[PDB]
Structure formats: C-alpha cells, structure tokens
C-alpha cells in the first residue's frame, strides 16, 4: 500500500461533498491524488528550504506558514 493511496476514496468523497459535489466519476480519485501530491510538493519544498536555511532538522509550523504565504495561499491560525 503506497502512502498516496492512504488518501482514500471515502476521504476524497468527503472533501468533494464539502465542495458541494453531488455525483463523482470513478477516475476522479486518481486525479485528486496527483493534484494533492503536486500541491504538497510545492509547499513542502518551500517549508524545508526555510528549515535548512535556519539550520534545523525540524520543519516548524512557521516554516509551513511562510511557505504557504509565498505561494499566495496564506493561512491564518498557526502563527505568523
């Protein structure tokens, strides 16, 4: 069992429902996973770059928050 498959149909189905979606094609599950992988790669890459620069080995909430902000995806509620 590959990690990305830990993001299961049921979880993907719940996200879509909160998104007001009514009926889901079967191919949607793999596509959503690719999309999440790309989103997470873009953000983690920036978080880890802030970590290394600070010479730490622990990615912190702030590193994630500054990474999200850099990408135009500002998040409130975790510092900064």
């Amino acid at each position: 069992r590959d990690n990305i498959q830990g993001i299961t149909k049921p979880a993907i189905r719940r996200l879509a429902r909160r998104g007001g979606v009514k009926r889901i094609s079967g191919l949607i599950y793999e596509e959503t996973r690719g999309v999440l992988k790309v989103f997470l790669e873009n953000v983690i890459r920036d978080a880890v770059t802030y970590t290394e620069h600070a010479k730490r080995k622990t990615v912190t909430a702030m590193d994630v928050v500054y990474a999200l902000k850099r990408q135009g995806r500002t998040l409130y509620g975790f510092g900064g």
Binding site: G19, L75, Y76, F78
Partner: protein, 107 residues
Amino acid sequence: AVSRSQRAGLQFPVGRIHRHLKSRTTSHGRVGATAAVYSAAILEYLTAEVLELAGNASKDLKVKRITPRHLQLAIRGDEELDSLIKATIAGGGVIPHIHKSLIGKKG
C-alpha cells in the same frame, strides 16, 4: 504618564506599532509622529469590524464564544471583508450551498 495610545483614545498599542514601523523602513528612514497613531486606529477599526460580525454570528447561534467557524461565517458573508481577507481560516469550513441544478427530483 498618559501613554500615546490612551492619549489617542485607542486600545491598540501606539508605542508598539511605532517601534514596528521603524523596522519596516528604508535603510536610514524615519517615522512621522502621528503615523503610528493612524495605523493603530486602522487596525483597531478592522478588528472591531470583524469581531462585531463574528460576535453577531455567534449570538444568532445562541452561544457565548466566537469560534473560527464564526469568523468564517462573518467574513465570507460580508462582501467587503470577503474581498479583503483572502487567507484560509483554519477550522472555518465553507458557507453552506447547493447548486440549484443538483437539488432536485425536479417536478
């Protein structure tokens, strides 16, 4: 003593805001005497505007504490704040809404 903030009739920290402005400066730049006052009044005002709507959102739910969900309700529900606050509010969810064409049985 009085204090800049009290002297201006504000709750927000004029002294602190001032200090902070001296650090968002052009190498050797200066900060006007009143600039901090003005800034502090602007932050105080917006904070009041959001608490006021978040506060109504919680009273209309017969509850005492403003939560992230209340803040999400107040912000996405007001055209001007919605426009100004693009950040994701952790724990806020979305405004309920189902497209007319999905709601159905039709006839």
